[PDB]
Paper text:
These modular proteins consist of a transmembrane pore and cytoplasmic leucine-rich repeat (LRR) domains. The five identified sybodies either inhibit or enhance activity by binding to distinct epitopes of the LRR domain, thereby altering channel conformations.
In contrast to the three inhibitory sybodies, which target each subunit of the hexameric [name] channel by binding to the convex face of the LRR domain, thereby stabilizing distinct conformations, the complexes with [name] and Sb5 display a high conformational heterogeneity where the LRR domains are poorly resolved in a majority of 3D classes. In both, [name]/[name] and [name]/Sb5 complexes, the sybodies bind to alternating subunits as their epitopes are only accessible in LRR domains located at the r-position of tightly interacting domain pairs whereas they are hidden in the dimer interface in the l-subunit. The smaller interface and lack of aromatic residues contributed by Sb5 is congruent with its lower affinity compared to [name]. Both sybodies target overlapping sites, yet with different binding modes and they bridge the large fenestrations between adjacent domains at the loose interface by approaching the juxtaposed l-subunits. As in the [name]/Sb3 complex, the conformational rearrangement of the LRR domains is coupled to the pore domain leading to the opening of intracellular subunit contacts, akin to conformational changes observed for the Sb3 complex, though this time at the loose interface. At such conditions, we found very low response in non-transfected cells and a pronounced, on average fivefold increase of currents in case of cells expressing [name] and an on average 2.3-fold increase upon expression of Sb5.
Numbering used by the authors:
A (entry chain D), B (entry chain C): 15 to 68, 92 to 176, 230 to 808
């Protein structure tokens, strides 16, 4: 009912031939059992154990009782009848039983029976699956249950292939059965043809029975001899057909090396070129099914293609993640735009394009993903993150992003991972590059197309570059903010900054320059400048910084600066100053000449004293002197009531002056890490400073007056 | 188990006839086995190997024992009884078995058994399909899974047809089987009719056994001979019927040329000419099923016709997208026009034309759309948007569109996918081209039909063109509005804009001119000019702007203009002029000669304070200096009474002048990102200012007195 698919035409023909042989055997057996008598008459004149056949004629008197005739018949039948005539039906019954056993040996051998049952069940599953139909049709949307069932079928197929690949028992067992059938046919043909001529109607008998009858020899007649001869010839012809069929099977087994399956036809005509050529013990069962019907093999092809696996994986992925689950996965980033981050997925779920509220999409380790056009449903998309994903795109989505995308982030370890189509994103304004780009004789080759980014305004370079790309210098004609992170690689300007005259922010982090380039000063449009981690020692180049009439903020944090040049007194244009984590030891008075200053951090330095001129900078809002050696505070500092916060931590401030409460606009303090005796009570008179804004160790905190404790706590509550 | 559907009436009759033949075969066989004795007597007077046939009568004494009679019977039965009388039933059994084997060969031959079971399975699937019931009843909405299974059935039918039309095995096998049946019938009837005469009741046997009985020849009676004779006559009659039926089947197979099926009645009973001529190995099963009955063939032919599949799949689409679902998804676009979006649909739902209330429709990513005449149902439709949707049009559809269309948007990724009929329309007022049509050596030829748009007035050409096509200038002799966006590509004018005398609103977006061409100056009737991000640096050409007498609006922002020339004040006609996002640092007093100016934007510029002359332009209502370096608000600006918006957010404003309450018409105020400590109270006396209208930080918003905040909240509430 189910294994009939596994029976080629030769097998079913041999089964029918065996059934016919069995019918012949049972008919001959019942015929011989019911009546197989001999009829014997004695030879009156006999020589050489055979009589010579020598008014009206009269009968011959033998003077024998009927029982004497019966006794002679029995004796001659048991003795002088050829054993072939006596035992032909049982012989053919035994031979056909052996043939049936040989046919069914591999079916009843559990070691290969389990493999055959698994093969047939899996082949039926692959034949009746709905996924293979659509896979062949394509050369979509489906239910959860059917998708997971199809996935289970795929993994069962892989397990079955692993199991049957190393077996190589079915092929040799089939060879053994075919050889056994062939040799049985050969011996049967030889001996049966040799002995068939030994059954005949006339037979002679000489049994040395005189004391019971008185005659020596008898001419016996075997009435069933001719019918048995006809049955024997019919059976011999049947065995000849059986042997011819078995020999054809043997030849079929030895003309194409059935151990190996070509598989080329369907793997090339269905465009699934990634279909393996099947190997031993698995090519053979596929050959058998081909002999039944190649359509089953064609259906089973799509479960080894290695590509249909990707298709099913992405389809089940699209099935699983629902828009509700994605919204629960939705997060708000630092820049306060609606964010969904995809990490370590085989592909992009299609339901992510159902969230019209999405603004920024991230792709972290997503292999072989091509952007579907359904991205058009995402109106708010402005930022796209490529965290180590080489992603392709099609024309409609490409145009949609060309007209809609504003920010792009590329994190890569290889240049080939960069999507070549990004250069058409003519509405792109901000791009972030992470990954080395220098190539042996092909460095700065991919980025030549950056001239196409006409609306580019922000660029992030993290590639350990030693010479700045010329194309960057060219495109900087409209750039407004440029950030580079060489991560320890020394960068040489080679006077390649005097063409990005539109730049308004220049950040050079970990570029290891050790000097301030002169082309910085030529950018009079600059406003904010940083020289992080370039091991700066002397910043006297600020002499040429007076050309920068609109330089507002300057950062020299995390450098090796030891002193503040007096020239900064001339550049009063500064509004934010960052100099922490340097080796600066003292504050010259000239620094206090920038009266419009609003931010000042001098943390992590060798500073020991605070000059009194700090009070001259009324607009200062925050102060940071963390990790310094200041022990006492000049009271003039407390004349800047508009100082919202101050960072005195990790210092050696012995005692806080009581004027601190005069700073009403103050809201935050840093006091942990300093050797203080008791907190001033006047500190608790600040209208806006709260326990949240009051940072200090608990031992100094408990010395606060109880009214101060209650006021700070109630400010924290509300 | 409806396998008999492939058995015609004659196959059934042959089966029954074979059953009867086998029945008489087993009857004759068991009769011959049980009793076939031939009773022989010697005759004393022999003439020519035969009995001469020559006081009361007395018997004849032959002097033979019973056993000698038995021996004579055996020998004469063996030798001189004609073999036909002995072996008639076995021959009948053999022939009946051969006939049954021929009849069931194709059922039991696995190669063709596979195709036959495949065909019967798919046919039984098709017969029970409600799709057939609905299609034949057509001569309303059901389950989606029903449409899906119908489409899957269509696909599997296509795949099977592709599989089986090339085989040509079942026909040749059936032909060979029926030929074998007929030739076997001929041979058997020949020999049986010839040899049935030897079934005689009495037979003379001359055997030459003298030494055993002493009689030369014997007369024998075969008692069963007459019964065998009538059995053989009956068998001959049955074989005659069987052979006549097989001859009829041969005639049926050799007159209709069964290799090709007709499928002709379909196009006259259901007007379905969507059915091919079925080739070999598939017409055969169709013919056989027809011989059963044609109802199955008819109810199966529908699944072959692709047009019926398309129409009922469209029915399924309508089942998914019902009219109420459409109106639920119905939206209004920004231009106050009822619009529905059809994004990534397989085909146009038919129900959409039940809603005449639509005037704008957008078709994006809907493959192979052919515009139906049912678009005539939508009278008020005026605008259609084509997004990557190559559309074929119909004559009623083209007629309706050439007289009931006002504006058209077509976007295309390739030249070949533009519909060619669009130029033929005459009522089209607005055409929107969005797609790179740049071609080499045959540029501006694909749109050579552009001159056929005689009612065109508004034209949007976003095609990344290097120079303006001459055909565009040809059509521009009568146009009104032209919008060009080259996406950063430089636009070449070269005396190709002075011919658009009737243009009313000119817009150049990222045309990369970098310098205003003189051509615009010849267009006196022009009203509004835009140069969005055309990399402009010098705008001296505004001196020639006095040629444009009615020029009231100017758009030059998103450019790199640093200094405003004075002579722009000579244009008193100006009404709205935004100049944000430029390098403007000081507004010349001459610019304030444009007394009729009403809307001004100066955001993202480098101003520090404002000239007094702005107070003299009372006609202004909207001012925008957002995100700038304006130190303080000059009070003279309060003299412009009808100001309803002041976009002053993100400035360096320190203290807001109290005269803000002087603006009664003041509606919207944005002040985020300003260094403002305290707010004036007059801000709460503005009748048209509301809490949403006033954009200010909530903690800073709490600086206002409680009455101010309460009044603003009450005004905003209703």
């Amino acid at each position: 009912p189910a294994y009939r698919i596994l029976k080629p035409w030769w097998d079913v023909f041999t089964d029918y031939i065996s059934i016919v042989m069995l019918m012949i055997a049972v008919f001959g057996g019942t015929l011989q059992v019911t009546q197989d008598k001999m009829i014997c008459l004695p030879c009156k004149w006999v020589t050489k154990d055979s009589c010579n056949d020598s008014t009206g004629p009269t009968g011959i008197k033998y003077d024998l009782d009927r029982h004497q005739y019966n006794y002679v018949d029995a004796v001659c039948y048991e003795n002088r009848l050829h054993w072939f005539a006596k035992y032909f039906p049982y012989l053919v019954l035994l031979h056909t039983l052996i043939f049936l056993a040989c046919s069914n040996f591999w079916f009843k051998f559990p070691r290969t029976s389990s493999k055959l049952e698994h093969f047939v069940s899996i082949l039926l599953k692959c034949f009746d699956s709905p996924w293979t139909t659509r896979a062949l049709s394509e050369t979509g949307v489906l239910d959860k249950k059917e998708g997971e069932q199809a996935k289970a079928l795929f993994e069962k197929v892989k397990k079955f292939r692993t199991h049957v690949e190393e077996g190589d028992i079915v092929y040799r067992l089939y060879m053994r059965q075919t050889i056994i059938k062939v040799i049985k046919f050969a011996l049967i043909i030889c001996y049966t043809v040799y002995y068939v001529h030994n059954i005949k109607f006339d037979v002679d008998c000489t049994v040395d029975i005189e004391s019971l009858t008185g005659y020596r020899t008898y001419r016996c007649a075997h009435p069933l001899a001719t019918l048995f001869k006809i049955l024997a010839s019919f059976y011999i012809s049947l065995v000849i057909f059986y042997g011819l069929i078995c020999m054809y099977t043997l030849w079929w087994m030895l003309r194409r090396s059935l151990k190996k399956y070509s598989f080329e036809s369907i793997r090339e005509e269905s465009s699934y070129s990634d279909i393996p050529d099947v190997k031993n013990d698995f090519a053979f069962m596929l050959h058998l099914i081909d002999q039944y019907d190649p359509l089953y093999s064609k259906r089973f092809a799509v479960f080894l293609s290695e590509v249909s696996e990707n298709k099913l994986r992405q389809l089940n992925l699209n099935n699983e993640w629902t828009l509700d689950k994605l919204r629960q996965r939705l997060t708000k980033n630092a820049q306060d735009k609606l964010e969904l981050h995809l990490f370590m997925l085989s592909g992009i779920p299609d339901t992510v394009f159902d969230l019209v509220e999405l603004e920024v999409l991230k792709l972290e380790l997503i292999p072989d993903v091509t952007i579907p056009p359904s991205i058009a449903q995402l109106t708010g998309l402005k930022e796209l993150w490529l965290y180590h994903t080489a992603a392709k795109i099609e024309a409609p989505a490409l145009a949609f992003l060309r007209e809609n995308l504003r920010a792009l982030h590329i994190k890569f370890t290889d240049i080939k991972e960069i999507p070549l189509w990004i250069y058409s994103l003519k509405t792109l304004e901000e791009l972030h590059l992470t990954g080395n780009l220098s190539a042996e004789n092909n460095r700065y080759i991919v980025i030549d197309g950056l001239r196409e980014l006409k609306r580019l305004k922000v660029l992030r370079l993290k590639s350990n570059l030693s010479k700045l790309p010329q194309v960057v210098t060219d495109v900087g004609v409209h750039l407004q903010k440029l950030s580079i992170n060489n991560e320890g690689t020394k960068l040489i300007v080679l006077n390649s900054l005097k063409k990005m005259v539109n730049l308004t922010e220049l950040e050079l982090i970990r570029c290891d320059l050790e000097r301030i380039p002169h082309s910085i000063f030529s950018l009079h449009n600059l406003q904010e400048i940083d020289l992080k981690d370039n091991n700066l020692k002397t910043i006297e180049e600020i002499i040429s910084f007076q050309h920068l009439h609109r330089l507002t903020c300057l950062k020299l944090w995390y450098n090796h600066i030891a002193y503040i040049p007096i020239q900064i007194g001339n550049l009063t244009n500064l509004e934010r100053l960052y100099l922490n984590r340097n080796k600066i030891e003292k504050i010259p008075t000239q620094l206090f000449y920038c009266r419009k200053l609003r931010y000042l951090d001098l943390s992590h330095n060798n500073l020991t004293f605070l000059p009194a001129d700090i009070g001259l900078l009324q607009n200062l809002q925050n102060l940071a002197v963390t990790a310094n050696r200041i022990e006492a505070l000049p009271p003039e500092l407390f004349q800047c009531r508009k100082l919202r916060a101050l960072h005195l931590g990790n210092n050696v401030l012995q005692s806080l002056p009581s004027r601190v409460g005069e700073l009403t606009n103050l809201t935050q303090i840093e006091l942990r890490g300093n050797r203080l005796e008791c907190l001033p009570v006047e500190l608790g008179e600040c209208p806006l400073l709260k326990r949240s804004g009051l940072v200090v160790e608990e031992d100094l905190f408990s010395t606060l007056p109880p009214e101060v404790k209650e006021r700070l706590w109630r400010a924290d509550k509300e």
